[PDB]
Design a protein around this ligand. Structure first.
Ligand SMILES: Cc1cc2nc3c(=O)[nH]c(=O)nc-3n(C[C@H](O)[C@H](O)[C@H](O)COP(=O)(O)OP(=O)(O)OC[C@H]3O[C@@H](n4cnc5c(N)ncnc54)[C@H](O)[C@@H]3O)c2cc1C
Ligand SMILES: Cc1cc2nc3c(=O)[nH]c(=O)nc-3n(C[C@H](O)[C@H](O)[C@H](O)COP(=O)(O)OP(=O)(O)OC[C@H]3O[C@@H](n4cnc5c(N)ncnc54)[C@H](O)[C@@H]3O)c2cc1C
Ligand SMILES: Nc1ccccc1C(=O)O
Ligand SMILES: Nc1ccccc1C(=O)O
Lengths: 340, 340
């Protein structure tokens, strides 16, 4: 059986590994291949800080809460392993800050030690009057992609750089299954009007003394459109931009100013930080993740497509649960083709 | 009025600053001079991680509980100030780990969001069944010493490098008040059987992924004699060594192995960290801090001595309350000389 995974971000790579880790034994030849037009450092995944944190509001598909819970348990059980440094994984605590009181998130029991802030803590942030504190995880995109690439490579998975024009292009050349993990670009392979870019711009700064994350939220400006500071392993991420439907992959000087002014006000110690660089990325925004089978009938025998895209601002937060689900659907295909 | 401060660690310098800040406007010839045998890089302060945390068990002098509170509030009010970086001051959270239930310490309401560890947090630590979590502060000794020196310079305090044989010697040269801040070496000037060296050895490691402090405690082995990991601004401090009476200012290979093996069991990710260096210091251990006046009968007249030493393993934690106390005592000497 021939498998073609399109996409080399966290979704593409993690899905390919799961599939292989779960079916390499039971299957005759299991030939897996990855096609992507962009790799390891030029993907959306690369731009992400890698904070584990779902949206505050409840998901449209309750199944998404499980996928996140599963990703958190997976990562947590590997956090104190000697290899964690290479994945870019570690424990991190921090603030969520609000102007007004708001209900507890549904994930409050997934994170470590969830609590509300205390008056003395709130005094440090004059502009905010309510908030949370908890311990979570960071999975740094760049590093995790590299780790996944190495794991897959020693599993004899082959990588090809190419832009796919259509599913048929791939089916025509021999694929039995196609796993579609194309992110914000999925619309180019099949009409999906529900799918939109949530453009975001972030800054890398050098401020080793920052040990906590600080996320702020403001309903007037919307999700991830208010200042945030996220320490990485070497560098610190500064953000605050979420523009729906903007496809411009270019650092905008005015957005740069919004980041810098917003973050310095939150944390004045940043005034003396060193700016290492800036990048722009596209959040695959969709009312819910498209994780489903589609059979592509092409005359005699047809080929199987598994869609896995539309993880918006929570692809790292949820990837692993999604990969198991994709692996689960792949399994259904095997028994249908009678090969359990 | 000629003042002589002996000692250029955290106690000497801070005390110097307060006295100068509090009385320069009400005294016409207020002359201050610091004498020290060792400066800014080679003091015990330089070797301290700079974590704010008192001893678990209550202080002998209850006044010490207050001096700690004052220091914490002082430092807290300065954390989000643009200059905090210079001082090496910042917020940090972390774990205190025990093998059994232990009572809440006095200082539970001083630190930010104190709470007990939850079962899931304890699962990350196999050898420990109880613990706390909270947010505290780091004052990097090396950096603060450097800051203090700059403040004193611009205020016109003069520094001299010389080892003082006796108070008598200093009184002879015309000093009206001697401020005695001589650390563990205080007994060389005046017999003090209660003061003993608490030798300590630390390791600087590069492990930027460490965002929390981890302190372990073992009742058998004693205070600061179990592994600990404390992230600094650029570097991570590994320790776990407290030996009473030992005067050897030399790194011990066995002590080294003890630090390293203990800290790797606790946090396996360190196995991959690169070692920068290693230093030894002496905690000025005393049943309680000596902070008091003593009239020294030297000739026809008599010179005032303010002692301020014996801060054990909480010199950084407590330095600011102490310095204000020493300034308070300085105020009395002034009313009595009729010059208030
Ligand atoms: C600024 C920012 C910060 C973020 N922070 C976080 C965070 O802290 N935590 C979190 O959980 N999530 C975060 N996210 C979201 C997360 O990064 C994304 O949801 C995640 O990267 C999506 O995975 P993926 O599908 O993008 O893989 P992708 O990045 O989409 O991989 C895409 C690959 O597929 C290829 N491709 C696309 N179309 C085709 C085609 N037609 N033919 C061939 N190849 C194609 C591309 O060349 C590319 O190489 C953040 C996003 C942004 C923008
Ligand atoms: C390994 C380690 C880690 C620590 N970590 C922390 C921590 O995380 N938090 C915390 O609060 N505390 C900590 N401490 C405790 C803290 O470091 C000390 O209590 C503090 O440094 C004491 O200040 P000081 O009196 O030592 O100044 P000192 O370091 O003692 O300065 C003394 C100066 O006086 C001079 N002097 C002495 N005698 C004479 C003389 N006769 N003539 C002339 N000059 C003389 C010396 O040359 C020296 O320069 C730690 C200690 C150690 C050892
Ligand atoms: N996904 C996120 C998680 C935390 C902070 C920012 C983002 C962001 O997408 O900008
Ligand atoms: N004063 C301290 C605070 C925290 C951890 C260790 C120490 C120490 O003296 O070794």
């Amino acid at each position: 059986m021939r498998v073609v995974v399109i996409g080399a971000g966290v979704i593409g790579l993690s899905t390919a590994l799961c599939i292989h880790e779960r079916y390499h034994s039971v299957l005759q030849p299991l030939d897996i291949k990855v096609y992507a037009d962009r790799f390891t450092p030029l993907t959306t995944t690369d731009v992400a800080a890698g904070l584990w944190q779902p949206y505050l509001s409840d998901p449209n598909n309750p199944q998404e809460a499980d996928w996140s819970q599963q990703t958190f348990d997976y990562l947590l059980s590997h956090v104190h392993s000697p290899n964690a440094e290479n994945l870019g994984l570690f424990l991190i605590s921090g603030y969520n800050l609000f102007h007004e009181a708001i209900p507890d998130p549904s994930w409050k029991d997934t994170v470590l030690g969830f609590r509300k802030l205390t008056p003395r803590e709130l005094d440090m942030f004059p502009d905010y009057g309510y908030g949370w504190f908890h311990t979570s995880l960071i999975l740094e995109g760049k590093n995790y992609l590299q780790w996944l690439t190495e794991r897959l490579t020693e599993r004899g998975v082959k990588f090809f750089q190419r832009k796919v024009e259509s599913f048929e292009e791939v089916a025509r050349e021999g694929a039995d299954v196609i796993v579609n993990c194309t992110g914000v670009w999925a619309g180019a392979l099949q009409r999906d009007p529900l799918l939109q870019p949530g453009r975001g711009q972030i800054m890398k700064v050098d401020a080793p003394w920052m040990k906590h994350f600080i996320l702020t939220h403001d309903p007037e400006r919307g999700i991830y459109n208010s200042p945030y500071i996220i320490p990485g392993t070497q560098t610190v991420t500064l953000g605050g931009i979420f523009q729906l439907g903007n496809w411009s992959e270019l650092n905008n000087i005015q957005d740069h100013n919004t980041i810098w002014e917003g973050c310095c006000r939150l944390e004045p110690t940043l005034k003396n930080a060193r700016i290492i660089g800036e990048r722009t990325g596209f959040r695959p925004v969709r009312p819910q993740i498209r994780l489903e089978r589609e059979q592509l009938r092409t005359g005699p025998s047809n080929t199987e497509v598994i869609h896995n895209y539309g993880h918006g601002g929570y692809g790292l937060t949820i990837h692993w649960g999604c990969a198991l689900e994709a692996a689960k659907l792949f399994g259904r295909i095997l028994e249908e083709k009678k090969l359990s």
